[PDB]
Amino acid sequence: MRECISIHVGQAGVQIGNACWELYCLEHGIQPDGQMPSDKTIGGGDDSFNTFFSETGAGKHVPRAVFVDLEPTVIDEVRTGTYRQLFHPEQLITGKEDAANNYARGHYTIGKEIIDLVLDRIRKLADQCTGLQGFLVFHSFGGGTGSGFTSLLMERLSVDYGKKSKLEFSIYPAPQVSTAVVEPYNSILTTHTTLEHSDCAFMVDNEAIYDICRRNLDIERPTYTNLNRLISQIVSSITASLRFDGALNVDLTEFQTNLVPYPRIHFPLATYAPVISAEKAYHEQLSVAEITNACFEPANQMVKCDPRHGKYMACCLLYRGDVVPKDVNAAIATIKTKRSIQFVDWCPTGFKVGINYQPPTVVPGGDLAKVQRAVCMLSNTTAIAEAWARLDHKFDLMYAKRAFVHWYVGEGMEEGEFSEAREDMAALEKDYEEVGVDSGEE
Amino acid sequence: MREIVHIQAGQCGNQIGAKFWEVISDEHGIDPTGSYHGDSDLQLERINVYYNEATGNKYVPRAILVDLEPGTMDSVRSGPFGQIFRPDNFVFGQSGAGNNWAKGHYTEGAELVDSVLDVVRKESESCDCLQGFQLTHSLGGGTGSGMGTLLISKIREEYPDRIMNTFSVMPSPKVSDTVVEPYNATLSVHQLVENTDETYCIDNEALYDICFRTLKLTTPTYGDLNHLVSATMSGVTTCLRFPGQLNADLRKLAVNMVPFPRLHFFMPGFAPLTSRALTVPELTQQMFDSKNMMAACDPRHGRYLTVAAIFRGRMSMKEVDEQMLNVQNKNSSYFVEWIPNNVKTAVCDIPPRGLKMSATFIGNSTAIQELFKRISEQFTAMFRRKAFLHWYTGEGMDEMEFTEAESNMNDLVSEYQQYQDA
Amino acid sequence: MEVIELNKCTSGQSFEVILKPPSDPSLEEIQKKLEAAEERRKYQEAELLKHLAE
Amino acid sequence: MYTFVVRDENSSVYAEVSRLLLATGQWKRLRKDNPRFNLMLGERNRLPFGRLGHEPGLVQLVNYYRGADKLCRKASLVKLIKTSPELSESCTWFPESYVIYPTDEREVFLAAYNRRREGREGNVWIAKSSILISSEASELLDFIDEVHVIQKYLEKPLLLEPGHRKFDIRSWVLVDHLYNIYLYREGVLRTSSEPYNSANFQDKTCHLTNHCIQKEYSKNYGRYEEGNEMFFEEFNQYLMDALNTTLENSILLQIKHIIRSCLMCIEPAISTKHLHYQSFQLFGFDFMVDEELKVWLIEVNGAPACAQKLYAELCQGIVDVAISSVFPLAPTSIFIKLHHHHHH
Ligand SMILES: Nc1nc2c(ncn2[C@@H]2O[C@H](COP(=O)(O)OP(=O)(O)OP(=O)(O)O)[C@@H](O)[C@H]2O)c(=O)[nH]1
Ligand SMILES: Nc1nc2c(ncn2[C@@H]2O[C@H](COP(=O)(O)OP(=O)(O)O)[C@@H](O)[C@H]2O)c(=O)[nH]1
Ligand SMILES: Nc1ncnc2c1ncn2[C@@H]1O[C@H](COP(=O)(O)OP(=O)(O)O)[C@@H](O)[C@H]1O
Ligand SMILES: [Ca+2]
Ligand SMILES: [Ca+2]
Ligand SMILES: [Ca+2]
Ligand SMILES: [Cl-]
Ligand SMILES: [Mg+2]
Ligand SMILES: [Mg+2]
Ligand SMILES: [Mg+2]
Ligand SMILES: [Mg+2]
């Protein structure tokens, strides 16, 4: 067994973290007080769940997690809520004033003042590990802390844990729930500075989640709570292989190996099915063929884009519930004759498949219905670059006028950092285009 | 980012400031003796932004009351909520400022300003993490205008990394005390351009028109004007005062609202306009209506750089989002295209007193140049003949300082015009 | 369509199906970048206080 | 009020559609870079499909299908036909075609060239790109060298009379957001005003029927009809008078078959049915007819013009079926809806 440390940064990172650990506890039968009856080895162990939980002699299972936010109100809620007992005080780190939706303020001004502390608290977690694999980092692109402090943390994490893998779960900005006009600036600044330090990043566009909640959970106006419960299901589907017995994606390194042949092109598209309303009185349960087919619908993706007009480098299918390989292969065969699934020439057209027999767990009283089988597809497709294009365009519109730039320079960031970051994004768009594309009044 | 220190200066500043405290105290369930008697926890969750907690579960406005004569503050102290203010936070002289910016800024005000700063410092000192300051004042008189901007300068020098926010009442011949108001306002605007982060432009012109044209008030009094102002002030501070996601503190508001540092003068609007059932569609239409704007500028004469909209009361958020999108989608030309998604919307469940629901509008529009052009024209009509200048040169000022203030305000105008056309 | 590397356990199974074959900055540097930015905040602030002193 | 942007100023069809949308009084045009539009009349090249369907509160529609270029590019069409089972290398309404780079189908092309050359079979081919007619391969290959397609040249065209002259048929086809396929009832024949001469593929005015070409090199341009355009009523009368048949029977059935076959083949690749934005597109299909009254597809155009006397009607039809279908305003359809569901 090799440990993984989760780090939750800023409001989106912290609140998503809360949702994930709640779900993890339900999945492993760990109670809010941290006790885990089914765990017969009191006070230690090297089971697969121990990758995410440590143990006390009192039999308390403690998330291997650090929460960091530059203001206290969100984390104070972690300290005072259901799972308050789960976490030791030192795991929950707060400042007094936040980054004011300003990457430069989170990264330079306030970051400089809290980074050594955050690192010390992580070091403490690391010293509890006999074989630390590396880090799962949750944050938004749009917030000042989410963007600016994370990039600083990732830089330093590479320095202090040079051999460790780092995975990201990143929230891409969507105006329907966003809180700042400058979020495109922050997204591009943080992506630029973080790119070389992240081995694999799962981007979730709030717009996609928002619309899935509206359309499939019949939620008229989704809240962060609705959104985060759904995100936590997807995150759980993705990390299940680290936390349960199995032979696919069993360590962080395997994520890069299976999903990222090109280091910079490390943003796999997640697609999830089925999402069914718990209030739906009568629901016909979906087959393996039906939920697999649904993996190739844009409406189910964590980022709206069109994989038909792109190319795949890799594809993994992660099932939970009553699923056997025979039906998966039958499903795929059929889907292959209908869908447009084009791989790049230098990769095999194939699927790595993982099946965990335990159906998805849902939070009692949540919005999601219990289902007999679910799947999360992780495909590394060039189509996700549509989302960079969207961001880069918005960035360009404002930057041409230097709108809001004075806020970043005033924190001691140089203007040149804007155009350097943008140039990197341009290079990134070009890379996706080359990988993914071939070459009048009439 | 928690505590705000409130300062109110001079006659206008103190009268509207007092009304602001009356209004929000009611909203937060604080009675005139500082005792809490509300029925909701939403009331107390962020109460510390504006109030200190004293002994006995007493809540005390973090508020400093300044004037160069005692008259208006004697009245404040006699006012309904007058006893809630901290007695040592009343700082006043005896001389008056005679509607003279020079007296407020350079002579009479100079003599008093240090003692104001002693009180501000004592307030800031007990703050767990001061966000910054809000100042209420007029620009047309002497104390609020000349001493108020002196204060802002000294406060910046002592807290240069904190946010400075003002509610600044702009003079109008329609509601005018003296002929020198354009002089005092031009001198003050230059101070504001340099030393505030966010200024709510409250135009006595707009307030009078609304009272006359819309509220059917034949003979509007300063009291009627202040009804609109206190309603607006409550609206624009809702996000600072109650739990919420958007513009929840002064810096995040500035970052969302101010794309270029000098262009930080906001046109506020409010609906419904008051002196029995409004739909989200109606709130939305009325909040964006020129007739509901408190700065007498035609927003169709310019473009919106940024907008914040705040809806209060129990209502459908779905419908709110739909209507806000409808406004932008159907009048998209008036929103600059080079700042994508430049309209932000908050919703707060608690409505203001006497209404089921309400909406407050904060616009950064290039049309605000019309208000400065108007002041600039009035300034020049007099300054070209050096009329009334002796009142200022007698306090040691020279004409060059007038030429400079005028030039900088014309520069401000040219700068709005630049982004109107970009 | 070939199936490979089938692994089974009590908790589930995994396999691969092929449909067709093919056809950093040091700590030092980080600190200097943060101090450069801090110096710049300091310079801008000093400029401000100078202007206010005038 | 619905809103739209115009991003191809050089398009005559959509300039007319724009003219029409305004004239309803319920559509407003925005600056071309304003993002809050219902309808994009897009640019021909590198249309930013990735930026569509991300505007909360706006149902967005665009007048191009992403991916339709597969049908509308010489080299792409050849590949699409050979490699798609529904069409296949054995497809009977598309002339033998090979993609030749200056992968490359050279050795395969020559093989069929030689095969014909040994069987004595007529052996004229035509090379063209996105034009040389010849019976010698060496010439065909050498020209290119100096991506293309070589295509069996239809040595036995149907020739109009009087004139002994060649022609091609343009059909306009509108595919809407539901993937309904609408064939405009009016087509047009682009005629050659010069008699067909099969002992000289050097002079191409009698071999290539493009309007532009007849409008210059042909000294009989306009001689038989205005300008070099015969419309369906007349062509039908001709077929009745001369060959004792109708346009519908001898030709149009094959055309509808071909149009439906092409578009149904690429539907899974380009359909916007479950997509966050929606597409429609107007296509110009070009056909040749041989002396057996057999129809051959020559090419599909992705951004066609219309015959002068047909803009009004077709352009009105576009807003009727493609636009007002999605964005309804406050017959005797000019289109034939191409649908057919044989059971087996
Ligand atoms: N899915 C989801 N998105 C969130 C959540 N909270 C905030 N966001 C998104 O994150 C972005 C804002 O970033 P935050 O995480 O709130 O900001 P922060 O990291 O705390 O940084 P500062 O407040 O500026 O110091 C916006 O795009 C929000 O819509 C959440 O709980 N869930
Ligand atoms: N809205 C409003 N405006 C006022 C009030 N009192 C004065 N004014 C305006 O303020 C200006 C006069 O300045 P004032 O505050 O009385 O002088 P000061 O005491 O020297 O600051 C003029 O433009 C008046 O119209 C008030 O209570 N409400
Ligand atoms: N295989 C062929 N047989 C006979 N004539 C052809 C053939 N291919 C093209 N032509 C002639 O050349 C003209 C132009 O070719 P085409 O590829 O259809 O249009 P364009 O070159 O304008 O894209 C046609 O209208 C037709 O008259
Ligand atoms: Ca154990
Ligand atoms: Ca590394
Ligand atoms: Ca004195
Ligand atoms: Cl290491
Ligand atoms: Mg935050
Ligand atoms: Mg007065
Ligand atoms: Mg043609
Ligand atoms: Mg062509």
Side-chain angles (χ1 to χ4, degrees), chain C residues 1-53:
Chain C
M1 171 142 151
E2 184 199 24
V3 173
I4 72 182
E5 300 184 335
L6 174 64
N7 287 97
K8 302 176 69 190
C9 69
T10 283
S11 67
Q13 44 190 316
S14 54
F15 61 95
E16 182 175 358
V17 49
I18 301 183
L19 308 177
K20 181 182 180 175
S23 302
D24 288 330
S26 63
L27 173 55
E28 172 182 15
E29 289 160 351
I30 293 171
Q31 280 298 331
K32 291 184 185 181
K33 106 165 151 163
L34 297 179
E35 292 176 342
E38 178 169 41
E39 282 302 289
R40 283 185 301 265
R41 286 193 306 283
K42 278 179 192 181
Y43 175 78
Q44 298 166 24
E45 190 167 285
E47 287 303 280
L48 167 69
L49 299 186
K50 185 204 314 305
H51 186 249
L52 286 180

Coordinates of all heavy atoms in Angstrom, one line a residue, chain C residues 1-53:
Chain C
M1 N -11.2 -7.9 -32.2 CA -11.5 -7.4 -30.8 C -11.0 -8.4 -29.8 O -11.7 -9.3 -29.4 CB -13.0 -7.1 -30.6 CG -13.4 -6.8 -29.2 SD -14.6 -5.5 -29.1 CE -15.4 -6.0 -27.6
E2 N -9.8 -8.1 -29.3 CA -9.1 -9.1 -28.4 C -9.1 -8.5 -27.0 O -8.9 -7.3 -26.7 CB -7.7 -9.3 -28.8 CG -6.9 -10.3 -27.9 CD -5.4 -10.2 -28.0 OE1 -4.9 -9.1 -28.4 OE2 -4.7 -11.2 -27.8
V3 N -9.4 -9.4 -26.0 CA -9.4 -9.1 -24.6 C -8.1 -9.5 -24.0 O -7.6 -10.6 -24.3 CB -10.5 -9.8 -23.9 CG1 -10.4 -9.7 -22.4 CG2 -11.9 -9.4 -24.4
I4 N -7.5 -8.7 -23.1 CA -6.2 -9.0 -22.5 C -6.0 -8.6 -21.1 O -6.7 -7.7 -20.6 CB -5.0 -8.5 -23.4 CG1 -4.9 -7.0 -23.2 CG2 -5.2 -8.9 -24.8 CD1 -3.8 -6.4 -24.1
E5 N -5.1 -9.2 -20.4 CA -4.7 -8.8 -19.0 C -6.0 -8.8 -18.1 O -6.2 -7.9 -17.4 CB -4.0 -7.5 -19.0 CG -2.7 -7.5 -19.8 CD -1.9 -6.2 -19.8 OE1 -2.4 -5.1 -19.5 OE2 -0.6 -6.3 -20.0
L6 N -6.8 -9.9 -18.2 CA -7.9 -10.0 -17.4 C -7.5 -10.4 -16.0 O -6.8 -11.4 -15.7 CB -8.9 -11.1 -17.9 CG -10.1 -11.5 -17.0 CD1 -11.0 -10.3 -16.9 CD2 -10.8 -12.6 -17.6
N7 N -7.9 -9.5 -15.0 CA -7.6 -9.8 -13.6 C -8.9 -9.8 -12.8 O -9.7 -8.9 -13.0 CB -6.7 -8.7 -13.1 CG -5.2 -8.9 -13.6 OD1 -4.8 -8.3 -14.5 ND2 -4.5 -9.8 -12.9
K8 N -9.1 -10.8 -12.0 CA -10.3 -11.0 -11.2 C -10.0 -11.0 -9.7 O -9.0 -11.6 -9.3 CB -11.0 -12.3 -11.6 CG -11.4 -12.4 -13.1 CD -12.0 -13.8 -13.4 CE -13.4 -14.0 -12.7 NZ -13.8 -15.4 -12.8
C9 N -10.8 -10.3 -8.9 CA -10.7 -10.4 -7.5 C -12.1 -10.3 -6.9 O -13.1 -10.0 -7.6 CB -9.9 -9.3 -6.9 SG -10.6 -7.6 -7.0
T10 N -12.2 -10.6 -5.6 CA -13.5 -10.6 -4.9 C -14.3 -9.3 -5.2 O -15.5 -9.3 -5.3 CB -13.3 -10.8 -3.4 OG1 -13.0 -12.1 -3.1 CG2 -14.5 -10.3 -2.6
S11 N -13.6 -8.2 -5.3 CA -14.2 -6.9 -5.3 C -14.5 -6.4 -6.8 O -15.3 -5.5 -7.0 CB -13.3 -5.9 -4.6 OG -12.1 -5.6 -5.2
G12 N -13.9 -7.1 -7.8 CA -14.2 -6.7 -9.2 C -13.2 -7.4 -10.2 O -12.6 -8.3 -9.9
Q13 N -13.2 -6.8 -11.4 CA -12.2 -7.2 -12.4 C -11.8 -6.1 -13.4 O -12.5 -5.2 -13.5 CB -12.6 -8.5 -13.1 CG -14.0 -8.5 -13.6 CD -14.5 -9.9 -14.1 OE1 -13.7 -10.6 -14.9 NE2 -15.7 -10.3 -13.8
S14 N -10.7 -6.3 -14.0 CA -10.2 -5.4 -15.0 C -9.6 -6.1 -16.2 O -9.2 -7.3 -16.0 CB -9.2 -4.3 -14.4 OG -8.1 -4.9 -13.8
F15 N -9.5 -5.5 -17.3 CA -9.0 -6.1 -18.6 C -8.9 -4.9 -19.6 O -9.2 -3.8 -19.3 CB -10.0 -7.1 -19.1 CG -11.4 -6.6 -19.5 CD1 -11.7 -6.2 -20.8 CD2 -12.4 -6.4 -18.5 CE1 -12.9 -5.7 -21.1 CE2 -13.6 -5.9 -18.8 CZ -13.9 -5.5 -20.1
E16 N -8.3 -5.3 -20.7 CA -8.1 -4.3 -21.8 C -8.7 -4.9 -23.1 O -8.5 -6.1 -23.3 CB -6.6 -3.9 -21.9 CG -6.3 -2.9 -23.0 CD -4.9 -2.5 -23.0 OE1 -4.1 -3.0 -22.2 OE2 -4.5 -1.7 -23.9
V17 N -9.4 -4.1 -23.8 CA -9.8 -4.6 -25.1 C -9.3 -3.7 -26.3 O -9.6 -2.5 -26.3 CB -11.4 -4.8 -25.2 CG1 -12.1 -3.5 -24.7 CG2 -11.8 -5.0 -26.6
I18 N -8.6 -4.3 -27.2 CA -8.1 -3.7 -28.4 C -9.0 -3.9 -29.6 O -9.3 -5.1 -29.9 CB -6.7 -4.2 -28.6 CG1 -5.8 -3.9 -27.4 CG2 -6.1 -3.5 -29.9 CD1 -4.3 -4.3 -27.6
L19 N -9.4 -2.9 -30.2 CA -10.2 -3.0 -31.5 C -9.3 -3.0 -32.7 O -9.7 -3.4 -33.8 CB -11.2 -1.9 -31.6 CG -12.1 -1.8 -30.4 CD1 -13.1 -0.6 -30.6 CD2 -12.9 -3.1 -30.1
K20 N -8.1 -2.4 -32.6 CA -7.1 -2.3 -33.7 C -5.8 -1.8 -33.1 O -5.8 -1.0 -32.2 CB -7.7 -1.3 -34.7 CG -6.7 -1.1 -35.9 CD -7.3 -0.1 -36.9 CE -6.4 0.0 -38.1 NZ -6.9 0.9 -39.2
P21 N -4.7 -2.3 -33.6 CA -3.4 -1.8 -33.2 C -3.1 -0.5 -33.8 O -3.8 0.0 -34.7 CB -2.4 -2.9 -33.6 CG -3.1 -3.5 -34.9 CD -4.6 -3.4 -34.7
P22 N -1.9 0.1 -33.4 CA -1.5 1.4 -34.0 C -1.4 1.3 -35.6 O -1.5 0.2 -36.1 CB -0.2 1.7 -33.4 CG -0.3 1.0 -32.1 CD -1.1 -0.2 -32.2
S23 N -1.1 2.4 -36.2 CA -0.9 2.5 -37.6 C 0.4 3.0 -38.0 O 0.9 4.1 -37.6 CB -2.0 3.4 -38.2 OG -3.3 2.9 -37.8
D24 N 12.8 22.0 -13.3 CA 11.8 22.8 -12.5 C 12.6 23.9 -11.7 O 13.7 23.7 -11.4 CB 11.1 21.9 -11.5 CG 10.1 21.1 -12.2 OD1 9.5 21.5 -13.2 OD2 9.8 20.0 -11.6
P25 N 11.9 25.0 -11.4 CA 12.5 26.0 -10.6 C 12.9 25.5 -9.2 O 12.2 24.8 -8.6 CB 11.4 27.1 -10.5 CG 10.1 26.4 -10.7 CD 10.4 25.2 -11.6
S26 N 14.1 25.9 -8.7 CA 14.6 25.6 -7.4 C 13.8 26.4 -6.4 O 13.2 27.4 -6.7 CB 16.0 25.8 -7.3 OG 16.3 27.2 -7.5
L27 N 14.0 26.0 -5.1 CA 13.5 26.8 -4.0 C 14.1 28.2 -4.0 O 13.4 29.2 -3.7 CB 13.9 26.1 -2.7 CG 13.6 26.8 -1.4 CD1 12.2 27.2 -1.3 CD2 14.1 26.0 -0.2
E28 N 15.4 28.3 -4.3 CA 16.0 29.6 -4.4 C 15.3 30.5 -5.4 O 14.9 31.6 -5.0 CB 17.5 29.4 -4.9 CG 18.2 30.7 -5.2 CD 19.6 30.4 -5.7 OE1 20.0 29.3 -6.0 OE2 20.4 31.4 -5.7
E29 N 15.1 30.0 -6.6 CA 14.4 30.8 -7.6 C 13.0 31.2 -7.2 O 12.6 32.3 -7.4 CB 14.4 30.0 -9.0 CG 15.8 29.9 -9.6 CD 15.9 28.7 -10.6 OE1 15.0 27.9 -10.7 OE2 16.9 28.7 -11.3
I30 N 12.3 30.2 -6.6 CA 10.9 30.6 -6.2 C 10.9 31.7 -5.2 O 10.1 32.6 -5.2 CB 10.2 29.3 -5.5 CG1 10.0 28.3 -6.6 CG2 8.9 29.7 -4.9 CD1 9.6 27.0 -6.1
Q31 N 11.9 31.7 -4.2 CA 12.0 32.7 -3.2 C 12.3 34.0 -3.8 O 11.7 35.0 -3.4 CB 13.0 32.3 -2.1 CG 12.5 31.3 -1.1 CD 11.3 31.8 -0.3 OE1 11.2 33.0 -0.1 NE2 10.5 30.9 0.2
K32 N 13.2 34.0 -4.8 CA 13.6 35.3 -5.4 C 12.4 35.9 -6.2 O 12.3 37.1 -6.3 CB 14.8 35.1 -6.3 CG 16.1 34.8 -5.6 CD 17.3 34.7 -6.5 CE 18.5 34.3 -5.7 NZ 19.7 34.2 -6.6
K33 N 11.6 35.1 -6.8 CA 10.4 35.6 -7.5 C 9.4 36.2 -6.6 O 8.8 37.2 -6.9 CB 9.8 34.5 -8.4 CG 8.5 33.9 -7.9 CD 7.8 33.1 -9.0 CE 6.9 32.1 -8.4 NZ 5.9 31.6 -9.4
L34 N 9.2 35.6 -5.4 CA 8.3 36.1 -4.4 C 8.9 37.4 -3.8 O 8.1 38.4 -3.5 CB 8.0 35.1 -3.3 CG 7.3 33.9 -3.8 CD1 7.1 32.9 -2.6 CD2 6.0 34.2 -4.4
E35 N 10.2 37.5 -3.6 CA 10.8 38.7 -3.0 C 10.9 39.8 -4.1 O 10.7 41.0 -3.7 CB 12.2 38.4 -2.5 CG 12.2 37.5 -1.3 CD 13.6 37.0 -0.8 OE1 14.5 37.2 -1.6 OE2 13.6 36.6 0.4
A36 N 11.1 39.5 -5.3 CA 11.0 40.5 -6.4 C 9.6 41.1 -6.4 O 9.5 42.4 -6.4 CB 11.3 39.9 -7.7
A37 N 8.6 40.3 -6.3 CA 7.2 40.9 -6.3 C 7.0 41.7 -5.0 O 6.3 42.7 -5.1 CB 6.2 39.7 -6.3
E38 N 7.6 41.3 -3.9 CA 7.4 42.0 -2.6 C 8.1 43.4 -2.7 O 7.6 44.4 -2.2 CB 7.9 41.2 -1.5 CG 7.8 41.9 -0.1 CD 8.1 41.0 1.1 OE1 9.0 40.2 1.0 OE2 7.3 41.1 2.1
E39 N 9.3 43.4 -3.3 CA 10.0 44.6 -3.4 C 9.2 45.6 -4.3 O 9.1 46.8 -4.0 CB 11.4 44.4 -4.1 CG 12.4 43.8 -3.1 CD 12.6 44.7 -1.9 OE1 13.2 45.8 -2.0 OE2 12.1 44.3 -0.8
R40 N 8.5 45.0 -5.3 CA 7.7 45.9 -6.2 C 6.6 46.5 -5.4 O 6.3 47.7 -5.6 CB 7.3 45.1 -7.5 CG 8.5 45.0 -8.5 CD 8.1 44.4 -9.8 NE 7.5 43.0 -9.7 CZ 8.2 41.9 -9.8 NH1 9.5 41.9 -10.1 NH2 7.6 40.7 -9.6
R41 N 5.9 45.7 -4.6 CA 4.8 46.2 -3.8 C 5.4 47.3 -2.9 O 4.8 48.4 -2.7 CB 4.1 45.2 -2.9 CG 3.2 44.3 -3.7 CD 2.3 43.4 -2.7 NE 3.0 42.6 -1.7 CZ 3.7 41.5 -2.0 NH1 3.7 41.0 -3.2 NH2 4.4 40.9 -1.0
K42 N 6.6 47.1 -2.3 CA 7.2 48.0 -1.4 C 7.5 49.3 -2.1 O 7.3 50.4 -1.6 CB 8.4 47.5 -0.8 CG 8.2 46.6 0.4 CD 9.5 46.0 1.0 CE 9.2 44.9 2.0 NZ 10.5 44.4 2.5
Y43 N 8.0 49.2 -3.4 CA 8.4 50.4 -4.1 C 7.2 51.3 -4.5 O 7.1 52.5 -4.4 CB 9.1 50.1 -5.4 CG 9.4 51.2 -6.3 CD1 10.5 52.1 -6.0 CD2 8.7 51.5 -7.4 CE1 10.8 53.2 -6.8 CE2 8.9 52.6 -8.2 CZ 10.0 53.5 -7.9 OH 10.3 54.5 -8.7
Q44 N 6.1 50.6 -4.9 CA 4.9 51.3 -5.3 C 4.3 52.0 -4.1 O 3.8 53.1 -4.2 CB 3.9 50.3 -5.9 CG 4.4 49.7 -7.2 CD 3.7 48.4 -7.7 OE1 2.5 48.3 -7.4 NE2 4.3 47.6 -8.5
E45 N 4.4 51.3 -2.9 CA 3.9 51.9 -1.7 C 4.7 53.1 -1.3 O 4.1 54.2 -0.8 CB 3.8 50.9 -0.5 CG 3.0 51.5 0.6 CD 2.6 50.5 1.7 OE1 1.7 49.6 1.4 OE2 3.2 50.5 2.7
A46 N 6.0 53.0 -1.4 CA 6.9 54.1 -1.0 C 6.6 55.3 -1.9 O 6.6 56.5 -1.4 CB 8.3 53.7 -1.1
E47 N 6.4 55.1 -3.2 CA 6.1 56.1 -4.1 C 4.8 56.8 -3.7 O 4.7 58.0 -3.7 CB 5.9 55.5 -5.5 CG 7.2 55.2 -6.2 CD 8.1 56.4 -6.3 OE1 7.9 57.2 -7.3 OE2 9.1 56.5 -5.5
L48 N 3.8 56.0 -3.3 CA 2.5 56.6 -2.8 C 2.7 57.5 -1.6 O 2.2 58.6 -1.5 CB 1.5 55.5 -2.4 CG 0.3 56.0 -1.6 CD1 -0.5 56.9 -2.5 CD2 -0.5 54.9 -1.0
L49 N 3.5 57.0 -0.6 CA 3.7 57.7 0.6 C 4.5 59.0 0.4 O 4.3 60.0 1.0 CB 4.4 56.9 1.7 CG 3.5 55.7 2.1 CD1 4.2 54.9 3.3 CD2 2.1 56.0 2.4
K50 N 5.3 59.0 -0.6 CA 6.1 60.1 -1.0 C 5.1 61.2 -1.6 O 5.3 62.4 -1.3 CB 7.1 59.8 -2.1 CG 8.1 60.9 -2.5 CD 8.7 60.7 -3.9 CE 9.2 59.2 -4.1 NZ 10.2 58.8 -3.1
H51 N 4.2 60.8 -2.5 CA 3.3 61.6 -3.1 C 2.4 62.2 -2.0 O 1.9 63.4 -2.2 CB 2.5 60.9 -4.1 CG 1.6 61.7 -4.9 ND1 0.2 61.7 -4.8 CD2 1.8 62.6 -5.9 CE1 -0.4 62.5 -5.7 NE2 0.6 63.1 -6.3
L52 N 2.0 61.5 -1.0 CA 1.2 62.0 0.1 C 1.9 62.9 1.0 O 1.4 63.9 1.5 CB 0.6 60.8 0.9 CG -0.5 60.0 0.2 CD1 -1.1 58.9 1.1 CD2 -1.7 60.9 -0.3
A53 N 3.2 62.7 1.2 CA 4.1 63.6 1.9 C 4.2 65.0 1.2 O 4.2 66.0 1.9 CB 5.5 63.1 2.1

